[model samples]
Target chain A: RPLSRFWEWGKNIVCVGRNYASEPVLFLKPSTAYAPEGSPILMPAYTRNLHHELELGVVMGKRCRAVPEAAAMDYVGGYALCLDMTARDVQDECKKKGLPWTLAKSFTASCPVSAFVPKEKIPDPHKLKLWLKVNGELRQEGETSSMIFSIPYIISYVSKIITLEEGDIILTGTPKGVGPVKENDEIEAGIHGLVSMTFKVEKPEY
Target chain B: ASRPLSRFWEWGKNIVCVGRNYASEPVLFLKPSTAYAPEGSPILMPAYTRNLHHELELGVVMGKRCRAVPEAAAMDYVGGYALCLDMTARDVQDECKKKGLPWTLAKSFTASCPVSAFVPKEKIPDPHKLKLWLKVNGELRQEGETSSMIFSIPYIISYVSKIITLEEGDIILTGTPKGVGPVKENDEIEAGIHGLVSMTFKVEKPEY
Candidate 1:
């Protein structure tokens, strides 16, 4: 089993939220949350409402700061199918208290990713079909073309705020279909032909 | 001469933050490495926020990687400690809370974390017994003792490492005590840990 580039580098898992419309909402998941393919998505003991947010993750190949949008993609190393497993209930509670989402969104195995697909393999990242299914039932389906923020724009925008380092992941926001998952549930997600991965939900071992 | 607060390290280190940990369920957050502003550097207020506040806290840096660390041995993972400011954009945080949004923009930006020089653990005999205080413009603003912390340093290390791996140099900002308030341009901020550390930062408008 090859370790994830992110895990290998021990860098931060940078995530984006609502980047398309109102502007980008960003957050970080510690490297401990990195779960490669074939790993189980442990349902954290703290929350009852655990959700699966399937997103297209952009992996940086180079370090950049305040990068211009026109040259943003130049920093691309590759892409992958990333799932931002969230504790919806905990997240809601944090939101109510005006707190950070670290505990709510960042936990062991909170980020599950597929094998990396080289950047050249995907002719156009902006035009791709990203979807996810549970137990063979379709739950989320969206196209990258529908994204509010283009890949280059997201990289550019994020670089200005946080320096984009090699091996750091940028989880593009998920499409509308986001719901809960439980222990024993099976998750299957993919990004067109670039890559696909499966995971089993398991109860957290406290 | 602008003393680069970035002397200890470069930008992009992960700053794992714990909020309300004292007497409350520890809430965790992340401040990108770029937020690190070392001693004598100015705390540049982000242009987008008007309510930038100061949260003085005890910052712990990890010595090595550890996962599911046991509380009994949590202290063995400590590399050192420092005085840190969890500089927050209060108004922006409020808006994010209302919208159920992530606090990245509200809590993280350049100079959001102003950390003092590292204090070796051996220098402080009892971390829990130390006194921490902050003053603004020569006026005592916030003061509290570490003994008031609801969560102990060992407990936080053990608990946080279970979710996020504790890597060498990764910082854990144990939550601040009460007396959090706002600061403006030209305000002088000073924080200290009894006889351990005393550092200062002047507030300034965002250069960008």
Candidate 2:
């Protein structure tokens, strides 16, 4: 209903990863770390070795802070599939120099997502099929049921640390099949029963 | 008026010619952003609190960039001064501290940073040894002199810029004294710095 209008949403993305049910790890993506659906997620003018991770996103509808795991899902505004783009080589160099991860992981159009699918539309958030293709070649294909962490768990974990307000987006990590993409590459992704978006990638101007 | 403009926080990382204990260091918690009652601006406050506490302190507006600069050169970094309130959301802030997160969201949210006109560094001769305080409901809530700071002026300016980059218009809040408390609806809070600068704000219906 609110489509076709320019509404501003604040995007604060925090990244956490676990190794096959191992201890969970964490990182943060600033408000600027975002790109729209079907947009060309860019590689910076500064560095090379950019990479991409296909992810599923959870959208929040209300402002929630320090929310418990049980009530976390109640704050769901919607859900969508996403791509967590990274600049791997730049990130490695930054780690060596002990600098902030922002310039490395965060660049313009680095995050491309599928259109939002309100949770109300789907009967079960789990058990959904997820697929990703680059240049029409299969890279990542999995079931949401295979995720080590569930939507309610991720939301509950994040809200306990920071306030997750309306329009905030949470991206569940990708399954194995992560890889690199180059200029002129095309990526198509679809979450089961939800719409998909095709993204055209290009090397940004230096 | 949303709130008053005043020095409220010393948010940053790192230390000076001394030690490193994040909490123990004496940078007073303050809010300058949402403490303004300009000529025509509407004042909004949550209806829960009945008293609006006005805190008066010198707002150090940096003129030049100084990161880890020596205390001797601290004066060179200052631009000017202004009158503003360090507004507070007392209930929300106390709750935040109880949760072990940051007080920035509750204590430092919305139209938090408000400033009055600028008084260049040269215009105000001595910053330290200056008088500062707050008055609400025609009663004193906070009153003290600049000499009371556990951390000196130059030490704060030089220490702050080392971690977070202090931009041109950014203001550093010197801490408040012993008289710290709350404010409420329909209360008038007035704050001033050493009798040279002052600003006031009024509480009203919050427009949400």
Candidate 3:
């Protein structure tokens, strides 16, 4: 069965922007942003450029604070594929104005996530390849190994700042090849040979 | 009586922060809800930051879900007020500012926000005319009147709701006035909204 069952248990959706060093920016998405498999990903009426950022999702199984990297993986409940949808134009505007990206990132149905996969099912989360496609055309493709910060490092690093509670998700940054998606489009994304999810895009009703 | 941790919790949500709104153009940022420190709790300095500062401000708690709320009905969404401290790692913030990076490390940390007991909306007649001030080690460090704010409370509520939906229990930290300075361990910090609410927190070293 698809692991979307964890959506109700979802807490904060912590996003790491530029997590590869040069300054890993951390932001948030409320639990309400979690869109389950087959759910429609709303293209909020407020923005023009809506982009898809495919990433590996790390689900915390327990509450931990200031966790050390050596024991970080022990706290993982499972792993899954996640999409960090963005409003590119609004994000750029926020960046230019030195304002918070709340509007650009936290709109309703912005995070479409797959069901959970037990940590034991994946031998090495850092070695998996993830990809995203729109209508059968690949838009983003990369190996999780390419991530500047490894899974343990990200878990340890982020836990130092924000306590990781059960069901809290950390989006381990996206790989290159992100682009815009329009209303009525279909999004298919997953970790290769592991799990996959599809979502429809539509404009939110006013 | 105080609900120390209160019924409101669920850390890691975004705590929207508005900066320079009371004086210059509105500058906004975010603090993870993990920064929340209930009354009687201590503020722990993050291991990564060296220069920490204290900013006293009024906190507005949302009571309803709203989007693009008009200024006219903004106050209606507010459930109550709180006296909050926007504990900032000044050094990290300045560095992020120069690099044009988000102020996450500089602003978000465990217990970085020390909030007072909730004060019902009717307790204060006019939020705009109240006085807000802070003292460290029993000595005054910063003081200002709410009337000095450049942005009105209603305007901020309306402006931010247009970007991020205002959900019940979400807090909006109104900008602090001019005087912002460093605070050290062992220092006792007391802040209040004159005659409305007051809270005290002790600064301590990071637990880890």
Winning candidate number (TM-score): 3
Task: Provide the overall lDDT of each model, using Cα atoms, as 2-decimal numbers.
Answer: 0.82, 0.57, 0.80
Using alpha carbons, what is the TM-score of model 1? 0.87
| Candidate 3 per-residue lDDT over residues B1-208, each given as its tens digit | 2222244544324577888755444676676677888876789898878799999888887767666788999999887888889999999887766665567778877888888888877887678888988999888888888888888999998887765665677788898987789998899998888888788899999768
TM-score of each model, in listed order: 0.87, 0.52, 0.89
Query: How high is the lDDT of residue A24 in model 1?
Result: 72
Top candidate on lDDT is 1
* Regions more than 4 Å wrong, model 3: A1-6, A19-23, A44-46, A93-99, B1-5, B9-12
User: Relative to the unseen true structure, what is the C-alpha lDDT of residue B132 in candidate 3, on a scale of 0 to 100?
Assistant: 88
Q: Model 1, B91-192: lDDT tens per residue?
A: 988888888788898888778899898887788767898888999999888888889888898998998887776666778889888899999999999999
- lDDT per residue (tens digit) for residues B73-152 in model 2: 88888767765555556665555445433333343333344345556677677777677667877787777776657677
TM-score of chain B of each: 0.93, 0.75, 0.93
Docking class of 1: acceptable
Give, for candidate 3 chain A, the lowest lDDT window spanning 10 residues: A1-10
Evaluate chain B of model 1: give its TM-score: 0.93
Ranking by TM-score: 3, 1, 2
In order, what fnat does every candidate score?
0.62, 0.00, 0.41
Q: TM-score of the B chain in model 3?
A: 0.93
TM-score of chain A of each: 0.94, 0.87, 0.95
